[PDB]
């Protein structure tokens, strides 16, 4: 298992990164410092997570300490849905850069295919509770992302939560200048994503798996929901390999040629989650984990199911 995967922009991306959604602002600086200290070189960020300033403090301090060099880090962020208009994309990227205290991003993603009305609210609502769309289409947002590459703000651009027809729309965009480098999607043994992964990989797009542990801290979790970390079948595979269940859940996507971005703010777990380059799941283990698919999503964007670009009505 090599530590990095080659992207279609010619750059290499670390296959293991640290997630930061829900990482409290008073804990995420130390989480990222610990992560870098114990070997992480890839941090997954987003403006909508409301903690990029604090992530940036950690990055800057580790650069200043010369624990790492900037070229060794791979920093990812994402354009929120209220910034899909062409006149807002650069400023949204620039706010992220200024918060992260960087002069470029390694990768900048369209966070969701759905554009929303611009304004202060991340989920602008009508009086009846529907999220108010933007009319700016996907393809025009992509052209604005391409301009960030040409301005030196970002090394690579990509997409997140795009279904295969939406990926295809960009690949088929008239005048396409840069292909997506990455599609970041939810993926774990309960949502195995074979069809969409195969499609993306066949086009040279690298897939990043988010919520690989099943996001036990997601704010809408219900007691009766399935739990990957507590699934006795996964625990058994972990025991056979003398690893933790989380370590198996992280190694699983790695062996599918995916990038994976587990989140933790717990120092012990941050270190645990990185010790996944010292064992191999068998093909039988992999197929067994794949067999647990139930099409179960952490992140279904349930407030946006009527948006024209809602991604999850299509099979994949
Ligand atoms: N593009 C998108 O739309 C999108 C959507 C979802 C997620 N993401 C990205 O993907 C990242 C990961 O997904 P996620 O945050 O939803 O969830 P996750 O990584 O599947 O799970 C995070 C949870 O697992 C716990 N945990 C971590 N390591 C553990 C271990 N070794 N043992 C036991 N529990 C452990 C964490 O607890 P502690 O933190 O308390 O240790 C936290 O509660 C996000 O943070 C974000 O960066 C992107
Ligand atoms: O957007 C994400 O990557 C993860 O969070 C979501 C996932 C959903 F299925 C639905 C909504 C959110 C959400 O409110 N996002 C904005 C701030 C919470 C970060």
From Swiss-Prot:
Residues recorded with modification Phosphoserine: 3
Predominant subcellular localization, coarse grouping: cytoplasm
Catalyses which reaction(s): an alditol + NADP(+) = an aldose + NADPH + H(+); all-trans-retinol + NADP(+) = all-trans-retinal + NADPH + H(+); 9-cis-retinol + NADP(+) = 9-cis-retinal + NADPH + H(+); 13-cis-retinol + NADP(+) = 13-cis-retinal + NADPH + H(+)
Site (Lowers pKa of active site Tyr): 78
Protein name: Aldo-keto reductase family 1 member B1
GO biological process: C21-steroid hormone biosynthetic process; carbohydrate metabolic process; cellular hyperosmotic salinity response; daunorubicin metabolic process; doxorubicin metabolic process; epithelial cell maturation; fructose biosynthetic process; metanephric collecting duct development
Quaternary data: Monomer.
């Amino acid at each position: 298992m090599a530590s990095r995967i080659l992207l279609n922009n010619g750059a290499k991306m670390p296959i293991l990164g640290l997630g930061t959604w829900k990482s409290p602002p008073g804990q995420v600086t130390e989480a990222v410092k610990v992560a870098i200290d114990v070997g992480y070189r890839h941090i997954d960020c987003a403006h909508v997570y409301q903690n990029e300033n604090e992530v940036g403090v950690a990055i800057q301090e580790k650069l200043r300490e010369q624990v790492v060099k900037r070229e060794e880090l791979f920093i990812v962020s994402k354009l929120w849905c209220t910034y899909h208009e062409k006149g807002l994309v650069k400023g949204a990227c620039q706010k992220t850069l200024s918060d992260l205290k960087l002069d470029y991003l390694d990768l900048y993603l369209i966070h969701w295919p759905t554009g929303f009305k611009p304004g202060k609210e991340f989920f602008p609502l009508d009086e009846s509770g529907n999220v108010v769309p933007s009319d700016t289409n996907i393809l025009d947002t992509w052209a604005a992302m391409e301009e960030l590459v040409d301005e030196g703000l970002v090394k690579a651009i990509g997409i997140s939560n795009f279904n295969h027809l939406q990926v295809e729309m960009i690949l088929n965009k008239p005048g396409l200048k840069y292909k997506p480098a990455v599609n970041q999607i939810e993926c774990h043994p309960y949502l195995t994503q074979e069809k969409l992964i195969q499609y993306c990989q066949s086009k040279g797009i690298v897939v990043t798996a988010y919520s690989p542990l099943g996001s036990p801290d997601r704010p809408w979790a219900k007691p009766e929901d399935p739990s990957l970390l507590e699934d006795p079948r996964i625990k058994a595979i972990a025991a056979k390999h003398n690893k933790t269940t989380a370590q198996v859940l992280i190694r699983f996507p790695m062996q599918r040629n995916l990038v994976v971005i587990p989140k933790s703010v717990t120092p012990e777990r941050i270190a645990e989650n990185f010790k996944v380059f010292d064992f191999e799941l068998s093909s039988q283990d992999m197929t067994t984990l794949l067999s647990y698919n139930r099409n179960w999503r952490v992140c279904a964007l349930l407030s946006c199911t009527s948006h024209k670009d809602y991604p999850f009505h299509e099979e994949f």
